């Protein structure tokens, strides 16, 4: 290595390692940041924008890198919004405190200063956060959607964004049971336009050769339940094997009426070449289904599971509201909507251009995340690196008051808090220093809610720009970043035990 020993050299090495790990996610901050390509070995290159996804698939081997990655992952798991912010902020803390380490500032002093600065910042945030929840968000939701379309302002979808926002929040309000991203899934269909994109309260899966066998199913059927079969469906002792095969083929039809299942599911291949053979069965079938569809059906409709060839149960045709099978873009898609627990909403990604999957999955997902997070909490603060500037100014003003070692460290903490708006305006591509200088001036003298505008590349009052972020999530992110920095600083040795 390079000076991994007691005290200062190992702390320097750990700080450098944290800088390296943060550099891998440095440029993905912001709603329109850069994007990364990761190849997973065999040749399935992965392309993604969100920082947490990038961190989850890294190959960290360094102990400091690992003990920052675990903090990032824990932050992501606890709250899904804001992961690349905590890692970047913690790395900035470490890099700003590093030039004070080799001068002999004992790291315990840095720990104490960081903890008191974080406590001060969390206290200060509470005097600035403003409650907006009651101000016409559940009823008279115009404010909700007015905050919602910000993820799609000043883009090609500017005219139609109101429709999608209002309709997705309509879906959200009727499903207000702590919605999740996995169980609210969208599906892409080839062809069509963007204006007519619609949301089915269920699933939307195309029927392929091995997916569904029989067509023209009884859509207007008011009790369709899934039957999970686990045996094949499609078709000296040289004649004994023929007899056994024919007997098995005949027995495969014992579930037509004895079991009594309208829709049957299997994990084995289904042959559409024998559609007329399945037309004799005259019922819908499912095969090679994805796990997402399976889970959505189970927690929505409640299909039964069968193991034996003649597995008979009372849940084969239980109570589910409606069955839907409508062609989408010239292709028939399976919709298992109409369920007693239909807490599902699959969105039809209609569109002629096929390459818009990244655009829609980066836009609508962020929009619904913002809507859900605004709904959950009551009080918010101005975003776009606005609260960070206020915290930096307050901490810089407070640091000059205290005498002693902690003054320089709190000043360095305040300086390190500036990296979020700097990185935002850097990823936006505009001159960062000018934006930062204007922001610092107008923010120290004029007001306390000015951040960075990504559209016109100028300072703006993000409060009236309706860029809301919950106070609690920001407080938690700041606390996690500071604690990760403290944990890195407090470590000065590693023990290997390589082989014996």
């Amino acid at each position: 290595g390079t000076d991994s020993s007691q005290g200062i050299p190992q702390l320097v090495s750990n700080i450098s390692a944290c800088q390296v790990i943060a550099e891998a996610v440095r440029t993905t901050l912001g709603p329109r940041g850069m994007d990364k390509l990761i190849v997973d070995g065999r040749g399935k290159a992965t392309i993604s924008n969100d920082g947490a996804t990038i961190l989850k698939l890294l190959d960290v081997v360094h102990p400091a890198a690992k003990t920052l990655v675990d903090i990032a992952k824990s932050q992501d798991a606890e709250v899904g919004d804001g992961t690349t912010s905590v890692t970047l902020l913690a790395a900035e803390f470490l890099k700003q405190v590093k030039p004070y380490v080799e001068e002999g500032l004992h790291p315990q002093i840095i720990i104490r200063a960081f903890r008191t600065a974080t406590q001060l910042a969390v206290n200060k945030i509470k005097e600035i956060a403003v409650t907006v929840k009651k101000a016409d968000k559940v009823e008279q939701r115009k404010l909700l959607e007015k905050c919602a379309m910000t993820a799609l302002s000043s883009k090609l979808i500017s005219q139609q964004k109101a429709f999608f926002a209002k309709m997705v929040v309509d879906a959200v309000m009727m499903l207000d049971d702590l919605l999740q991203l996995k169980m609210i899934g969208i599906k892409k269909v080839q062809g069509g336009a963007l204006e007519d994109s619609q949301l089915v309260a269920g699933v939307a899966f195309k029927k392929t050769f091995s997916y569904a066998g029989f067509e023209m199913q009884p859509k207007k059927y008011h009790n369709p339940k899934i039957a999970l079969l686990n045996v094949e469906l499609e078709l000296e002792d040289y004649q004994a094997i023929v007899d056994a095969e024919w007997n098995i083929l005949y027995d495969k039809l014992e579930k037509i009426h004895h079991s009594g299942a309208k829709v049957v599911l299997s994990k084995l291949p289904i042959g559409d070449v024998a559609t007329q053979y399945f037309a004799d069965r005259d019922m819908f079938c499912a095969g090679r289904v994805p796990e997402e569809d399976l889970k959505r059906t189970m927690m929505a409709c409640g299909g039964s599971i069968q193991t034996s060839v003649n597995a008979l149960s009372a849940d084969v045709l239980g109570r589910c509201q409606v069955f839907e099978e409508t062609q989408i873009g010239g292709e028939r898609y399976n919709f298992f909507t109409g369920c007693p627990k239909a807490k599902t909403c699959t969105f039809i990604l209609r569109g002629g251009a096929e390459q818009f999957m990244e655009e829609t999955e980066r836009s609508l997902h962020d929009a619904i995340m913002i809507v859900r997070r605004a709904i959950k909490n009551d009080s918010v603060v101005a975003g776009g690196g606005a609260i960070e500037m206020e915290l930096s100014k307050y901490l810089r003003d407070y640091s000059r008051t205290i005498p002693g070692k902690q003054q320089l460290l709190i000043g360095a903490y305040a300086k390190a808090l500036e990296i979020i708006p700097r990185q935002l305006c850097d990823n936006a591509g505009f001159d960062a220093t000018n934006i930062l200088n204007k922001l610092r001036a107008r923010h120290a003298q004029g007001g306390t809610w000015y951040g960075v505008d990504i559209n016109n590349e100028d300072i703006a009052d993000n409060f009236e720009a309706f860029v809301w972020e919950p106070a609690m999530v920001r407080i938690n992110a700041l606390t996690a970043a500071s604690e990760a920095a403290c944990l890195i600083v407090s470590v000065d040795e590693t023990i290997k035990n390589p082989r014996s």
């Binding site: 440029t27 990364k36 990761i38 070995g41 290159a45 190959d59 040289y238 094997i241 010239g330 990244e358």
Partner: protein, 505 residues
């Protein structure tokens, strides 16, 4: 001995642009009707020569991830339409190679990408403006002949090009649906037979199976409509007992088939030739040892369905036949199986008997892209005069728009104009004439004259106006090509780093 594996953002962009200009500028020479074709050789045992850019990029193997990305989505575009892949690739390469200098100027890639999108929108509206499309191309059997000259003018197939043009117009007529305007996989107009000549690819709307005969003495010409398909398998005196059991099983094909009505019920697996002669005396032909996936092909001659099982066989779902004809399918080889007696095939496929392989691929790809342009013509009868004239008009338009534009969008659209100008230079260079002189002259002529069809005459004909030369391209194809190229340059500019697990520092 001090190699480093760090890839910073700007050098990463430089590397990606180098890779793109490597995958581009390689198939650039293939652009145009007289472009230099690429001889593709398999890494193990195959060699081929072709000029289609989509084909050469699909066969070619690329190491860099950027190249893999671009080629796989070009495959996707080829699946979508199948035309303009060369234009897309060369245009994206042009954009990247001339935006490298914008990057060197210090512009952030996001600014370049957004400016390129704005320029693409300007180009789209401008090309939609100057469309002189004809809307009568529905009952246009005679104009359809000159529609496909450009896509077949690269070879000497012009001797019998009118015959295949009539074949194509008949094919589009027999599937002409005003509701959906689409062709499916089962309706594929593809079958390659070795041996023959140009005119041997003639109009036959039937089912083609190159299997063997029931019996050398069996009369090949049959007209009875009781055709059928079955999957009849071959599945110490015990050997004699087994033979007798198999004969008794096949007795249902001899005796217990009259009440069912399956005379021409061909088989698939091993069989005893004695019972074949017995059925020959009984006048029930049955072809033995037929292929696997031919069950649907022979059961679609009248638009019916597939019935390969024993009990599923019904009179209403018997074998199907196309149309009675008595011509020797094999001049030197034995005759091909006649399955054409009864009714027109909804999954219509036209016989092809070309004498050269490369002739086979060129003919089938010409038929495919001719169908593609027609399926666009019926869904949207909008066409524009290409040949670089449209590109020149778009470049001038976007250069005009750069006069009233904000800063980095101004530089981006100025870059976009020069990038669009690449298509005329590529066409002229492939034509052998001066790559830059001719494009500049035609640009000056097109700014002097309001005519937007003044392109580059790569066939060395009289004038630069392709209205007389019938060089025509649809609005949808060009729109998709330019939009996809812009999407490519945007998304490749977005990428700033590539990380691979398994580092080897």
């Amino acid at each position: 001995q001090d190699r480093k594996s760090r890839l910073m953002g700007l050098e990463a962009l430089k590397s990606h642009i180098m890779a793109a200009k490597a995958v581009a500028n390689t198939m650039r020479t293939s652009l145009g009707p007289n472009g230099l074709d690429k001889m593709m050789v398999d890494k193990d045992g195959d060699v081929t020569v072709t000029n289609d850019g989509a084909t050469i990029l699909s066969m070619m193997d690329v190491d860099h991830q950027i190249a893999k990305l671009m080629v796989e989505l070009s495959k996707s575009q080829d699946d979508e339409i199948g035309d303009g892949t060369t234009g897309v690739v060369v245009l994206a390469g042009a954009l990247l190679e001339e935006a490298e200098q914008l990057l060197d100027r210090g512009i952030h890639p996001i600014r370049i990408a957004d400016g390129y999108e704005q320029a693409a929108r300007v180009a789209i509206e401008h090309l939609d403006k100057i469309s002189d499309s004809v809307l009568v191309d529905i009952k246009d059997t005679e104009p359809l002949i000159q529609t496909a000259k450009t896509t077949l003018g690269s070879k000497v197939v012009n001797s019998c090009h009118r015959q295949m043009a009539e074949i194509a117009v008949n094919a589009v007529l027999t599937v002409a649906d005003m509701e959906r305007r689409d062709v499916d996989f089962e309706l594929i107009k593809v079958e390659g037979k070795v041996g023959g000549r140009l005119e041997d690819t003639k109009l036959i709307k039937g089912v083609i199976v190159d299997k063997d005969f029931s019996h050398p003495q069996m009369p090949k010409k049959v007209e009875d409509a009781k055709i059928a398909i079955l999957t009849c398998p071959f599945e110490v005196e015990d050997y004699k007992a087994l033979q007798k059991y198999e004969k008794e099983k096949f007795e249902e094909m001899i005796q217990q088939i009259k009440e069912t009505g399956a005379n021409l019920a061909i088989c698939q697996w091993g069989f005893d030739d004695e019972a074949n002669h017995l059925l020959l005396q009984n006048n029930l032909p049955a072809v033995r040892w037929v292929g696997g996936p031919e069950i649907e092909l022979i059961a679609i001659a009248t638009g019916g369905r597939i019935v390969p099982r024993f009990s599923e066989l019904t009179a209403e779902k018997l074998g199907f036949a196309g149309l009675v004809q008595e011509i020797s399918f094999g001049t030197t080889k034995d005759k091909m199986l006649v399955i054409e007696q009864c009714k027109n095939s909804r999954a219509v496929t036209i016989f092809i008997r070309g004498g050269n392989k490369m002739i086979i691929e060129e003919a089938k790809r010409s038929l495919h892209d001719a169908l593609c342009v027609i399926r666009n013509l019926i869904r949207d009868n909008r066409v524009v005069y290409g040949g670089g004239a449209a590109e020149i008009s778009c470049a001038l338009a976007v250069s005009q728009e750069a006069d009233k534009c904000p800063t980095l969008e101004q530089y981006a659209m100025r870059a976009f104009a020069d990038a669009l100008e690449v298509i005329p230079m590529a066409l002229s260079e492939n034509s052998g004439m001066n790559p830059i002189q001719t494009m500049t002259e035609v640009r000056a002529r097109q700014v002097k004259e309001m005519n937007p069809a003044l392109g580059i005459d790569c066939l060395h004909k009289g004038t630069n106006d392709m209205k007389q030369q019938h060089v025509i391209e649809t609005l949808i194809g060009k729109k998709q090509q330019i939009s996809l190229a812009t999407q490519m340059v945007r998304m490749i500019l977005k990428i700033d780093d590539i990380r691979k697990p398994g580092e080897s520092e």
